[PDB]
Design an enzyme around this catalytic site. Structure first.
Site, short mmCIF file in Angstrom:
data_model
loop_
_atom_site.label_atom_id
_atom_site.label_comp_id
_atom_site.label_asym_id
_atom_site.label_seq_id
_atom_site.Cartn_x
_atom_site.Cartn_y
_atom_site.Cartn_z
N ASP B 150 -47.20 -40.21 44.11
CA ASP B 150 -45.79 -39.84 43.94
C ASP B 150 -45.69 -38.33 43.74
OD1 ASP B 150 -43.08 -40.03 43.78
OD2 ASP B 150 -43.02 -41.18 41.91
N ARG B 154 -39.53 -33.28 42.19
CA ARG B 154 -39.03 -33.77 40.91
C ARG B 154 -40.16 -34.14 39.95
NH1 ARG B 154 -39.37 -38.18 44.39
NH2 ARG B 154 -39.79 -40.17 43.36
N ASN B 155 -41.37 -34.37 40.47
CA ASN B 155 -42.53 -34.72 39.65
C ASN B 155 -43.38 -33.51 39.31
OD1 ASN B 155 -42.57 -37.50 41.81
ND2 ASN B 155 -41.95 -37.59 39.65
N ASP B 168 -45.77 -36.89 35.73
CA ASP B 168 -45.40 -38.23 36.18
C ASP B 168 -46.58 -38.95 36.83
OD1 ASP B 168 -43.05 -37.13 35.32
OD2 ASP B 168 -41.93 -37.46 37.17
C1 VJH Z 1 -41.55 -35.02 30.71
C2 VJH Z 1 -41.24 -33.54 30.47
C3 VJH Z 1 -40.00 -32.91 30.56
C4 VJH Z 1 -40.18 -31.58 30.26
N1 VJH Z 1 -39.20 -30.50 30.22
C5 VJH Z 1 -37.87 -30.59 30.81
C6 VJH Z 1 -36.99 -29.51 30.69
C7 VJH Z 1 -35.73 -29.63 31.26
C8 VJH Z 1 -34.66 -28.55 31.23
C9 VJH Z 1 -33.60 -28.49 32.12
N2 VJH Z 1 -32.86 -27.43 31.80
N3 VJH Z 1 -33.45 -26.82 30.72
C10 VJH Z 1 -32.94 -25.62 30.07
C11 VJH Z 1 -31.99 -24.83 30.97
N4 VJH Z 1 -30.61 -25.00 30.54
C12 VJH Z 1 -30.31 -24.08 29.45
C13 VJH Z 1 -29.71 -24.73 31.65
C14 VJH Z 1 -34.53 -27.48 30.37
N5 VJH Z 1 -35.43 -30.75 31.89
C15 VJH Z 1 -36.28 -31.74 31.99
N6 VJH Z 1 -35.83 -32.92 32.70
C16 VJH Z 1 -36.77 -33.89 33.22
C17 VJH Z 1 -37.86 -33.47 33.97
C18 VJH Z 1 -38.75 -34.41 34.47
C19 VJH Z 1 -38.55 -35.76 34.21
C20 VJH Z 1 -39.52 -36.80 34.76
C21 VJH Z 1 -38.95 -37.52 35.98
O1 VJH Z 1 -38.05 -37.04 36.58
N7 VJH Z 1 -39.53 -38.79 36.39
C22 VJH Z 1 -39.02 -39.51 37.54
C23 VJH Z 1 -37.66 -39.74 37.69
C24 VJH Z 1 -37.19 -40.43 38.80
C25 VJH Z 1 -38.08 -40.89 39.75
C26 VJH Z 1 -39.44 -40.66 39.60
F1 VJH Z 1 -40.31 -41.12 40.54
C27 VJH Z 1 -39.90 -39.97 38.50
C28 VJH Z 1 -37.46 -36.17 33.46
C29 VJH Z 1 -36.57 -35.24 32.97
N8 VJH Z 1 -37.48 -31.68 31.46
N9 VJH Z 1 -41.47 -31.43 30.02
N10 VJH Z 1 -42.13 -32.62 30.14
#
Ligand code: VJH
Ligand code: VJH
Lengths: 289, 289
Positions: B150, B154-155, B168
Site C-alpha cells: 500500500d 497518503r501513506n 501505514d
Molecule cells: C499516524 C501519524 C500521523 C502523523 N502526523 C499528522 C499530522 C497532520 C497535520 C495536518 N496538518 N497539520 C498542521 C498544519 N495545520 C496547522 C494547517 C498537521 N495530519 C495527519 N493526518 C493523518 C496522516 C496520516 C494518516 C494515516 C492514513 O491516512 N491511513 C490511511 C487512510 C486511508 C486509507 C489508507 F490506506 C490508509 C492519518 C491521518 N497526521 N504522524 N503519524
C-alpha cells in the site's frame, strides 16, 4: 482472476440496464460499506412516467477490489429477492460512466438514526411491530437459502408508514448446497454483532443471523444504543466463551430479555428459528392491549 | 481461530508496554485504514523526561476482525524495522483499556496533503529529493524481505526538515520464504495503485511495489493529483492488459516520465529495482544544477 471474470460478465442482462442520461444525482446521504449512497431522481423508470426519487449506491474515490466485488454481489442478490420488507432494486448503469446501482428510497433513513432521534413519540408496541417485520423478511431470505451476515440497525431502512426494509446486501452469501458459508480469511462484520462460532470458527449460517437479530433487538429496546458499552471489541473473545452476555436493559420486559438470551445460546441448534421468533413477538403485542 | 490466538498471545513483550495513565489523547488527525489516528502526548516515554508529542493509532467504533488483525500486524512489523525514513514505534497500551499503538508524530502530515497545499514554494529538485528518500526506505524494507503493498502519497509522512517517513504498515506482509505473498481472497488496496499481476493473479512481490512507486512518482510531479483521472476503477482491467498507461503529465521531464514507464512494464522482471531507481533519481538532480 475471480473479479476480472465477473466484471467482464456484467458487460454482456437487459432487463436491468437503465440509461444514464435519465439519471440525476443529488446530495450524499451517507457513506456505505463499499462506497457512498446518493439521493437521486430517475426519469421514466420501470414504466413509471415522470421522475421518481431513488437512492444510488456507487463506489467512492480509491475503491479497492473487495469493494468492487461487494458492489457486484449486492446487485446479484437484489435481482433475485422480492418481499415487502426487503429493499427493492430498479436497475443499474454500467456503460458510459461509473458503476451505479439504483434502489428504493426510504423517507426516514436507517433504523438507527430514526431511533436515536426519538424518545418522536414511540411506544413499546411500535418497537415490537418493527422487530416483527424484520423477522418476516429474514424468514423469507432464509427460505431462499441466503445469509445476510451483517444484520444490524444501521442496515435496516424505514420507509413510508414506518415499514421496515432490510438493506445492505453486499456481504450476503448463498448457502443452498452446504447450508453454511465459511470464510478462510478474517471477516469484515463488526465484532459486537457476530455469533460466537462465526467469531472463532468463521462459520456463517441461518442461526448466526439469529444471534445478530438478538443484538438488533437490544439496539431497538435501547433506542439506538451501542452494544457491550464500555468494552473493547478485542475483549469479547474471552467474555463470550466464558458465558457472559449483555445485562438486562432498562425499559425491557422479562419476556423480551428472555428472547434475547435464547438468540445468544452457544449451541446454534439451541437457538430459535425466525418462524418461532415471530410467534413470540406476535403474542407479546396481543397481550399488552 | 487465527485472530483469537494472536490476541491472546499479545496479553503475555515488556519492552514495548507503556502505562496508560501517562497517555493523554487529543484531537483526531484523521481516519486510518483500520481506525482513527489521534494526536496525543506521552509522559516519560522511552526514558525521555517530560512530555513528548506523539500520534496514536486505535480502533474506531464498530471494528471488524480484519481491522483488528491489521492493527496487530502493523505492531508486529514496526517493532522489527529501524531506518531514518520509516516511522518509529514507541510502545503500546494493551491493558486496562482499548488497544493503542504509539508512533512518531510528523509535523506536516501526509505527503498528499502537504503537496495539495503547495505550488508553499516547491521546486523540481525538492520533488526529486522526496522520491529519493522514499526509495532509500523501500530499499531497506526489501532487504528485510517485506512487501508494503500500500505504497502511496497518503501513506507517506512529512516530518521536521521535510524528511519523508514511510508509514501505514497494516497491509504489509513477510516474504522471506517464497519471495512473494499471495492472497486467495480479494484485496483491500486501491485498484489504481496495484500492479497488473497483483490485480489479476493476486501476487504481491518487491516488483509490485515498484509499480506502486511509479504511481507515487506521478502523484508527486502532479502535486497531489489523482491517478487515471476520469476513468472508473472497473475499467482499468481492460485498459492495463491492452498496454495503456497514464500519459505524459505536464511539468515533467522525459527522463522522469521514462522512469515511470519502466515501473509499469508488464513483465515484473523487466521493471527496475529500488537500488537502480535511486541512481536514476540521484543523477537527475546533479545535472539540473
Ligand atoms: C499516524 C501519524 C500521523 C502523523 N502526523 C499528522 C499530522 C497532520 C497535520 C495536518 N496538518 N497539520 C498542521 C498544519 N495545520 C496547522 C494547517 C498537521 N495530519 C495527519 N493526518 C493523518 C496522516 C496520516 C494518516 C494515516 C492514513 O491516512 N491511513 C490511511 C487512510 C486511508 C486509507 C489508507 F490506506 C490508509 C492519518 C491521518 N497526521 N504522524 N503519524
Ligand atoms: C441506500 C438507501 C438510503 C435510503 N434513504 C435514506 C434516507 C436518509 C434520511 C435521513 N434523514 N432524512 C430526512 C430527515 N431530515 C429532514 C432530518 C432522510 N438517510 C439515509 N442515509 C443512509 C442510510 C443507509 C445507508 C447504508 C449504510 O449505512 N451502509 C453501511 C455503512 C457502514 C457500515 C455498513 F456495514 C453498512 C447509507 C446512508 N438514507 N434509501 N436507500
Amino acid at each position: 482472476g475471480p473479479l476480472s471474470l465477473s466484471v467482464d460478465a456484467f458487460k454482456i442482462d437487459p432487463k436491468w440496464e437503465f440509461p444514464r442520461k435519465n439519471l440525476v444525482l443529488g446530495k450524499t446521504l451517507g457513506e456505505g460499506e463499499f462506497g457512498k449512497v446518493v439521493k437521486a431522481t430517475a426519469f421514466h423508470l420501470k414504466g413509471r412516467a415522470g421522475y421518481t426519487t431513488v437512492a444510488v449506491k456507487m463506489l467512492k474515490e480509491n475503491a479497492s477490489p473487495s469493494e468492487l466485488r461487494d458492489l457486484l454481489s449486492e446487485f446479484n442478490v437484489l435481482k433475485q429477492v422480492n418481499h415487502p420488507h426487503v429493499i427493492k432494486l430498479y436497475g443499474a448503469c454500467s456503460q458510459d460512466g461509473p458503476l451505479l446501482l439504483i434502489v428504493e428510497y426510504a423517507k426516514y433513513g436507517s433504523l438507527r438514526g430514526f431511533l436515536r432521534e426519538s424518545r418522536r413519540a414511540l411506544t413499546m408496541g411500535d418497537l415490537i411491530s418493527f422487530a416483527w417485520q424484520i423477522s418476516q423478511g429474514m424468514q423469507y431470505l432464509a427460505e431462499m437459502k441466503l445469509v445476510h451476515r451483517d444484520l444490524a440497525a444501521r442496515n435496516i431502512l424505514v420507509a413510508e408508514g414506518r415499514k421496515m426494509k432490510i438493506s445492505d446486501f453486499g456481504l450476503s452469501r448463498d448457502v443452498y448446497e452446504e447450508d453454511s458459508y465459511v470464510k478462510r480469511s478474517q471477516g469484515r462484520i463488526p465484532v459486537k454483532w457476530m455469533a460466537i462460532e462465526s467469531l472463532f470458527d468463521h462459520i456463517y449460517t441461518t442461526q448466526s443471523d439469529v444471534w445478530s437479530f438478538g443484538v438488533l433487538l437490544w439496539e431497538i429496546v435501547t433506542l439506538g444504543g451501542n452494544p457491550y458499552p464500555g468494552i473493547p471489541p478485542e475483549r469479547l473473545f474471552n467474555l463470550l466463551k466464558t458465558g457472559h452476555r449483555m445485562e438486562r436493559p432498562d425499559n425491557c420486559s422479562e419476556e423480551m430479555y428472555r428472547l434475547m438470551l435464547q438468540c445468544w445460546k452457544q449451541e446454534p441448534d439451541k437457538r430459535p428459528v425466525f418462524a418461532d421468533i415471530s410467534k413470540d413477538l406476535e403474542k407479546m403485542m396481543v397481550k399488552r392491549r
